[PDB]
Design a protein around this ligand. Structure first.
Ligand SMILES: [Cl-]
Lengths: 150, 149
């Protein structure tokens, strides 16, 4: 089946009212408009999206919704550097240095927290700046991404 | 003789018996240790700075101080984009986008204000981000500069 339009996002509804099948996406594939998947329940599903969200596909974005069945997007965990800034000035320094390296950056759960894909030089940079950071397996959700130019 | 050492800053001086001649620098000429200038009064000077401030010369830095004559730095006012963030999330976006373009960035007067030299590309980019911005004539003082690494 080939889907051409998203139908919103699981946060807009009560998911327990529905059987939710997922398609698994890598964080770095979320900006694809044309792709094919096998859902976790083995359904053949493709996308050829006319107008995708500019941030890319987010967690819970709904590809298909009929009666009580949903096919929704899950973004796969990846190795992630989590950043804990301690001041507004630090937030500025960090984002500026990370932008200079052109590394992807995402907002974290709090206004002083950020996430970036694990890369050795990124790690080195933060350690160099003396910024508190953690390496974990986590989701890089498109809707949290800081835009390259948008 | 070649000026090899800074002699402090006007902020810390006692001026009663000191007339000041200025060297007028552009914001982009403050970082180099080696340079020559002509003072506002027409004096030729050359520097080759031993233990230069990391960020560069700043407003009021004293290059020469003898007889009772001082030569000190004035950074010329230039066309500057002033950015006023309204949230921490807005600071992060601003600084990340400017960083991405490798444009110069300076701390403003408050934790949410930031300055960058005016360039059309940077202004277009800030307008699209939807952040409060305006261009004024101001000084980009080296000590407010954010650095790379
Ligand atoms: Cl001036």
């Amino acid at each position: 089946m080939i889907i051409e339009r998203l139908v919103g996002n699981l946060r807009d509804l009560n998911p327990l009212d529905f059987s939710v099948d997922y398609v698994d996406l890598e964080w770095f594939e979320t900006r694809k408009k044309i792709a094919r998947f096998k859902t976790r329940q083995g359904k053949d599903i493709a996308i050829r999206l006319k107008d995708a969200p500019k941030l890319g596909l987010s967690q819970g974005d709904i590809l298909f919704k009929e009666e009580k069945e949903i096919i929704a997007v899950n973004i796969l965990d990846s190795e992630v550097i989590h950043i804990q800034a301690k001041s507004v000035a630090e937030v500025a320094k960090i984002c500026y240095e990370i932008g200079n390296r052109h590394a992807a950056l995402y907002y974290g759960e709090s206004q002083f927290e950020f996430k970036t894909p694990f890369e050795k030089p990124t790690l080195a940079l933060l350690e160099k700046l003396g910024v508190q950071n953690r390496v974990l397996s986590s989701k890089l959700d498109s809707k949290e991404r800081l835009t390259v130019s948008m």
